[PDB]
Amino acid sequence: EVHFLSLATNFLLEMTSMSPDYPNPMFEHPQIKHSSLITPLQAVAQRDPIIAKQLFSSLFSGILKEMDKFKTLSEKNNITQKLLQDFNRFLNTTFSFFPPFVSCIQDISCQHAALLSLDPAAVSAGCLASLQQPVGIRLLEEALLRPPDVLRWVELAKLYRSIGEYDVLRGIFTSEIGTKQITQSALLAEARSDYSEAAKQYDEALNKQDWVDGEPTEAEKDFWELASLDCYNHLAEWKSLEYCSTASIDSENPPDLNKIWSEPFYQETYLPYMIRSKLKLLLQGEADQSLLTFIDKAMHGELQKAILELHYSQELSLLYLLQDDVDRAKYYIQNGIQSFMQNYSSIDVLLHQSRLTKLQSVQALTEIQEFISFISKQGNLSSQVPLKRLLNTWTNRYPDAKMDPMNIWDDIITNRCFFLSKIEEKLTDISSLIRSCKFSMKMKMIDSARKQNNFSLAMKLLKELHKESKTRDDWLVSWVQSYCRLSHCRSRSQGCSEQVLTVLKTVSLLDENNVSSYLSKNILAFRDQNILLGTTYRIIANALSSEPACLAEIEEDKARRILELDSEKVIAGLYQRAFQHLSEAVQAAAGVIDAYMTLADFCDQQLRKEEEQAYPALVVEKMLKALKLNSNEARLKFPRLLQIIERYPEETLSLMTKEISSVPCWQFISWISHMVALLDKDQAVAVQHSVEEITDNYPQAIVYPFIISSESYSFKDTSTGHKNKEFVARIKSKLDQGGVIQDFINALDQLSNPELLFKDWSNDVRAELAKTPVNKKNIEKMYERMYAALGDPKAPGLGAFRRKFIQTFGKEFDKHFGKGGSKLLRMKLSDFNDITNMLLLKMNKDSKPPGNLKECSPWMSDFKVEFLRNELEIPGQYDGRGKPLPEYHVRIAGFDERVTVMASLRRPKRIIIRGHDEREHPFLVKGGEDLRQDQRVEQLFQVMNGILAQDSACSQRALQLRTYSVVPMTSRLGLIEWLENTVTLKDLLLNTMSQEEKAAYLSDPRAPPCEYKDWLTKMSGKHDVGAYMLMYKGANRTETVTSFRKRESKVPADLLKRAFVRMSTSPEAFLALRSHFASSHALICISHWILGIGDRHLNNFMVAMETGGVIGIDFGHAFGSATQFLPVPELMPFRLTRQFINLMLPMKETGLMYSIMVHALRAFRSDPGLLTNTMDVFVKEPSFDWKNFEQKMLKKGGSWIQEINVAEKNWYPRQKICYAKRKLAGANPAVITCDELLLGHEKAPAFRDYVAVARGSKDHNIRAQEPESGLSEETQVKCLMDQATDPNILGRTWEGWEPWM
């Protein structure tokens, strides 16, 4: 079979010699004879296999395409049945599996009509052993499109079980092999790492008796056994694994022999758990004596030997080391390393997580090799210092926490303790360092297992080590500290009832010894003990304060122990206990950061509770004495200080100055646009010395935050506020000495387009003066900003320079700015701006936007850096997170001579500037847009995926929000980072359509645009907005649903699937292009909902055509503001439309876009509150008031015009944090849209229909059949996914939001 493809194409091409066409088939002048291509084509095929596979697999389908003209209907079916029988015989009869042949038959099968039903249990057994899984997965899914249709799902599960991918594995075990009600409540409780309830409710389902409600088929009757084996294997359950593996094939006392060697399905999925569990149980010290005899009786033959030597071999090396014949084990481990290299060299290179699960065992293999090569010297044991350096290099080399699953941890730990026991025999202080090394490595194992939510695996290790931890004092106090940490962490998931019940029991255990004359000599753990008890009293006092008196009812001794430490004088006393135990440790490296920050956060949350003592004196000192050190958790909490000092101005102000002036002056550069805005605010003397220090040292990182805070700073005349304007003048005068940053910003102002700037000024003046013309001198104070930029051709020369655009615009407007100089400079009427509009329609038909070169702003086009005149240092570095190096940021060195406009409303421009590091950096410039909104939401994305990279269950999936960069240099001018080779989502879905699909989608009377518009007319009557106001009381439920399906069904189905097959052209690459798109879209759909972002239409999604991952841009409505203030609201939480569903067929939606969402939301709402603090100190900034918001919404022209009359007071920047804190702390996502549609559309006409459609029906939807508060993550994302696709909602939404695609 190694040569069969080459021989096949040789015989298939030999007969063209007896064919009459070799007549120079290019027949012209620039030819090549026909023999000069077909001869080297078959000469190259017999040298390497891949191009031969491609030649055969193309020529076969060519012949079968040509056969379909003649050879009429009756014969083709028999021919295809013969080919099907032949391919079945190939797969069943092949002996040494060849990858570019197995892939060749499974490639030519999957493109024809009758060949699809190949052999759905031979495809799996071939692809699992030739290591060509992607193509069999694609073949089986293509057969499941267009009983045999259940075993196919079993073999698809068997394929996806081998390459990781467990989310899509459990996405078919709850939708296809289902229809019962224990599999759902077991897979839901094994989705989270909760491997005890789902291994305790499989015995209850496997020992069932009655079940006459529909008897379950034999497809899940073994799947329950397999999954119970797996969920017994994950946590350390050895004795109850061998029994469940061997006690379903034969009799009770073990006859285990050729029983498992016969019926080869019994050989696959019952052997490895058995030999693994027997070896593991022998590794702790027993006799066992049962797998040795089976191995020695199977150590004959060819079949019963050439599988057990081919697969495992490492257990064989351990077993012969246990029988102590070393060179037998040496031969087997050398075969093992050769086997590992042979396995790794055949996985296709982008098939990640399979290569990780292969790469995570070389440490154990080399540990066995190191042990043998250490023990194989007689003089090695002639002293103890080789053992000493051995223990040192063993202790230094761990598998990491938080990214390695726990069976690998147990592999390394079990092998290391077995090697230690064998060395402890072969060499006879010495017998104390071995025990100390053992105990320390086991404690590292427990501390790793606590982190990644394996608590049932934690508790048994706690109780296993517990009898040893009595010989000293330090070991016992470290043990009880680890127990207290474990019971602290494992109580965060349990409900409000069992919380106090499970944290009370980790109090009385500590009344024994770690106090008997140990907390007087050592002082290091003295702090950690007080920290632990203070946090325990914090948990107890926080528990029953949520639900006040029903919680301290059901329990006698618990209530007596609580009231030992009414009904309010126990809660206040418990808070007193917590504050006292937290002030013990602070009065008693990197351990002081914890002791500071616990007291910091406890007093901060108590103050936020109290606002609805000497706590501000304890917050600021204990926080800043840790911020003096490098502390990233304390680095993000600075505006909490800048709020506590403002609202508490009486004490702790000179304290604040004395602490803030003695600090490293580089840990404020992220918060610099707060401190430079606090200057105009009174009590700014606390922030003057640090600002002067940073403008002395790093003078570049304050420039662009200072221009806007000096653009509006109107002072006071009181005696404490006179020197402040002089200090502002001092910093302004000592900054920008070269006069060059102002020229940079002026050139970027000259780069943009003034034709929309005049439109922006027109809407500004027609919205300013049209209320009542008594506003004093503001038009005369704002006309100079128009007249400097536009006017004579001498004003841009005096500002920055001559323009190629001013040569055709400022020279032009002299014959219509005469009317301006006559009346518009002294207008004071606001009665007719149609005179501006008739000139404005002239300003677009004869104008030239395409400036075609860099020469529109010639300061940058001829740069030529020469000496130190405040060199520019490209805008966008100084991220913070440590000490900067202000020499190695890339200085600007040149501007490229080509600009490109973009496709939007405004048409922004793109510049291609160069760095002194020889690279080219592209960028995009935005003329006339405020950008302290997008900068703030990128800071939110940075804190969000700083959270996400510490939860283990998202770290193993490697989930990160892919950010970008914005720089707001001055107001209305900012740079935004452009990325290379990305395409908008609408452009992907609109290029992928064929030539008549797209054209008859756009221009068509039956098109889903025009059908939706005619539906809007026929339900309401007019042809504008307000038809939406009549439609909600103009149509019932069951009419819009059918009318929505009828126009949904006119778009093609496989459009994203065709988009990912058009560009992948390799069945391996199609899998890891679809899966990455699905994972990234799941993560941004759950991260756009916590801070509720609306307006998620087509062009605000950008995908990257090199790895298929979406990027989210254009952050219009930051908090809940798409359903408050639009005229027609939107009610969906995110965008999960038809195409995002039809990409995932045949799998249902619970496979991949669901477990990502569950794990991400569990990562989010398990935090101390850093996201809540940062959302709070974002929304409490006075730069985006109602005036700035309406000025932002007026930037585009559209559905928002006027008519609020209420929302000047209804902005309410406390209720937004109230609602985001609610839907972060558990809230039904039909109630949040209910409340936020009430608070903006109270006393609206069709308010009842809005609140009805957002509510549900209690017939179809799960979002109407749930409590409005106190939900959980899986049900929360379940009703979330229900509301995202409720066809009553999507039938009534905005016509440009595109709900039908």
């Binding site: 007969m15 080297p40 084509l41 190259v44 290179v349 080399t366 130190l868 040149g894 560009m1063």
Partner: protein, 676 residues
Amino acid sequence: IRIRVVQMLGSLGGQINKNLLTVTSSDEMMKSYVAWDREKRLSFAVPFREMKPVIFLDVFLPRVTELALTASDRQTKVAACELLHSMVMFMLGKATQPPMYQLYKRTFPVLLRLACDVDQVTRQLYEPLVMQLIHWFTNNKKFESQDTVALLEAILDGIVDPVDSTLRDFCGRCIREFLKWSIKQITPQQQEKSPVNTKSLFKRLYSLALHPNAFKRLGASLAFNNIYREFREEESLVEQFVFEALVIYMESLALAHADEKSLGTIQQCCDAIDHLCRIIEKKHVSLNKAKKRRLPRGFPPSASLCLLDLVKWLLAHCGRPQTECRHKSIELFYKFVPLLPGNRSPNLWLKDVLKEEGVSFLINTFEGGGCGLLYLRGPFSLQATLCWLDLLLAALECYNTFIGERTVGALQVLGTEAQSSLLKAVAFFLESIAMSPQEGERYNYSKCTVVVRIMEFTTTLLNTSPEGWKLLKKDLCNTHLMRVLVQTLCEPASIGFNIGDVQVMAHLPDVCVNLMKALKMSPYKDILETHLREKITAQSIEELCAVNLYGPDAQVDRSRLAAVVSACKQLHRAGLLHNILPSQSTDLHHSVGTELLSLVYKGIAPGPSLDLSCKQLASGLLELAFAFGGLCERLVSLLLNPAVLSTAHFSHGEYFYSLFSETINTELLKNLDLAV
């Protein structure tokens, strides 16, 4: 090797180990794992006897194209090259009856990497193919279409890249073929429109040339070295672009100031400008007129730019602190002055304009814009200090050729009648010249590269007109310049001259001795005598010439001897040794010389082992000991000696002859007829 890879990868750890595969998995591999064109072309129809099915000839293009570069078997490499050549001919023949430039942009930059790779027979193929399809693409039957721009950018993307030094000189030949065939075919009745024409290529060259990248100017210079064979040997095209763009080649040369000396860019740009200055002196020796000329980057606009403003821009930029531009501009100033219609010379011209344009006007174009703080006495490398040092060096090397030539005088340009700033600047410099470690020696090199220029300036000022001695001050006649001169004479491991170089370490004793010879004829030889008469005296020699010499002392005593040995040898080359050290009131025979000879004679007597540097020191000392006087009769009397040196007893004179045997013979052959 593979077993060692897996063993080290195992012992490397667990948090380190998974750095291996997780780089990105999409950098270069996910440009080979993607399609080339969306809608397929190239339908091949293998003709059977009756059927003729159709085969799409794209699906095994990106594997043939990878076989033909790294095959590691010349039985399949020639198969893949034959298949790829036939496939290129087929896909070229298909499109001439289906746009495929998305295929051209990935099948053209592999033809060059084939066509100049290693092997000779795959060089005999693919060289005429890619030299023929240039002739086809640069024809009017396929002119100005998008397919030719793919070839041109394929050529340029070849010419500027890291490590393909066998390919860049091939892309030069492609540009030469391009330029030849792009005027061999296009006719001037239609050669006024093309954006891939000659002049568009020239603007592409200049926009390449002013680039902060290191390689995009090396690419422009390779292009110009390949197009200077044309652009001069035909007429009616030369007098427009590059006879202005000589300044842009010189400005790219200036921009190449601090890249690397070992890059290979200065040697290319110097030849690039010289290959054209050897044609400006073949036509503009005669052809000079006020025709319609084109303006380059920097000059004021006019109607003609004949020659006279180019040399004025040069003489206004001869103090430009970019050194490789400054050298070429001064050199071109000297070889461009004698081509005015007066057939002038520098000696008439510069004084002829200095009398009638202002005395400070030829001062500020020498001092530059950097004439206008004790924070630098700590030895460090603040970027202000290095740039001021560069300005000072420009101001220092500007005068060094105009005074040294007969173009100007010395007391004319300098003196009290002008009140310049360099005379004060060097005295400011000579205060703390003799005074984060990774940037200290970076400051030390550029500090030490200017004291040599100071010494050369002090040399060249005197020996051209010795009537203006007293215009300099006396701080240079004091314990700063006559301190650093003794420093660079004996032990310049103090003022910053590190050793580990080969240029300045070899160039110190060629400038110290010529400076001293430039001061013995000076009237102030007495300051030199009274300074140097304090360090190399007889008592200092006998306190350096110790009594314990050959032991475990490796560096110390032999170094302390070798310092004054090198010092006196430099003095003897200078011809100033009897103006420092005279002998006793006796005969010729210098007493220090007789003492040194007796010392080396009686040292090897026992009481002896050796080394290599000990013998080098002994040979240097015994070579100095003959430089004092005649002394050869004493040497022969030493050689013929009947003493007996016993050993657990050979001759005691043959040993002393046998060790050295070269210095003795070359001293005996220095004087004849009184030796034999």
